[PDB]
């Protein structure tokens, strides 16, 4: 069957997981790109044999599991390897993402993709939701969470797509500048629309 996909994105410290949990509370299955990336290298996964062949047998632990810290460290000391690893994992991530979307039974699925704009992944979504906050909020919340400097978070902000680049591809925008609670009402309104879009998209003769 065809699943209706709502992608969710936002920059660092915007509240992507916070908003995703509110949809999950309403019964929506959430597919998270970062969890999918960890799953393709789990014990017994196909990518593990390729990784051992490329980086060395010692990239694998005693029980057959990936020495994740050792891999992260090896790629940081060999920049070209980062690209080699992403190229190997990409198709596997695409397949696993599709598998999880097909396996979700909620009316529509919420696909949380931090790199949605950077990687042009909005092309694979039926609807795009952006959780938006000011840059100051991004900085303050990340600083509090990780106990890091303003400068450290600014560097991440400058590496990510801009706020305006995310807004330019959004169908809907949810504000998360307020406190942890205006989110429920806004999520409920969006959810009610998503249920309608999902119930009608397969037969919808004309565009919106
Ligand atoms: N590119 C990158 N480079 C380096 N580190 C990166 C990184 N991307 C992520 N991290 C690392 O992952 C953590 C969460 O990611 P994220 O900030 O992109 O996560 P989101 O899913 O957008 O956000 P949440 O985890 O939902 O919320 C983040 C923080 O804000 C708080 N928060 C959320 N809504 C709030 C609200 N309404 N009022 C006050 N605080 C709120 C949360 O408790 C949490 O401390 C970062 O702090 C950093 O450690």
UniProtKB/Swiss-Prot annotation:
Protein name per UniProt: Dephospho-CoA kinase
GO biological process: coenzyme A biosynthetic process
Function: Catalyzes the phosphorylation of the 3'-hydroxyl group of dephosphocoenzyme A to form coenzyme A.
CDD domains: DPCK
Predominant location: cytoplasm
Effect of pH on activity: Optimum pH is 8.5.
The EC number(s) this enzyme carries: 2.7.1.24
Keywords annotated in UniProt: ATP-binding, Coenzyme A biosynthesis, Cytoplasm, Kinase, Nucleotide-binding, Transferase
Transmembrane segments: none
Species of provenance: Escherichia coli (strain K12)
GO-annotated cellular components: cytoplasm
Subunit text: Monomer. Forms homotrimers in the presence of sulfate. The trimeric form exists in solution in equilibrium with the monomeric form.
């Amino acid at each position: 069957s065809l699943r209706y996909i709502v992608a969710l994105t936002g920059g660092i410290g915007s509240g992507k997981s916070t908003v995703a949990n509110a949809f999950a509370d309403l019964g929506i299955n959430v597919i998270d790109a970062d969890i999918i990336a960890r799953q393709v290298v789990e014990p017994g996964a196909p990518a593990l044999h390729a990784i051992a062949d490329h980086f060395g047998a010692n990239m694998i632990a005693a029980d057959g599991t990936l020495q994740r810290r050792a891999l992260r460290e090896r790629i940081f000391a060999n920049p070209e390897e980062k690209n080699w690893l992403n190229a190997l994992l990409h198709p596997l991530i695409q397949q696993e993402t599709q598998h999880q979307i097909q396996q979700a039974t909620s009316p529509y699925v919420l696909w949380v993709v931090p790199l949605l704009v950077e990687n042009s992944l909005y092309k694979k979504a039926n609807r795009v939701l952006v959780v938006d906050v000011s840059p100051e909020t991004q900085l303050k919340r990340t600083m509090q969470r990780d106990d890091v400097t303003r400068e450290h978070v600014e560097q991440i902000l400058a590496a990510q797509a801009t706020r305006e680049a995310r807004l330019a591809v959004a169908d809907d925008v949810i504000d998360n500048n307020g406190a942890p609670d205006a989110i429920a009402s806004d999520v409920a309104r969006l959810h009610a629309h998503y249920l309608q879009l999902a119930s009608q998209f397969v037969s919808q003769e004309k565009p919106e």
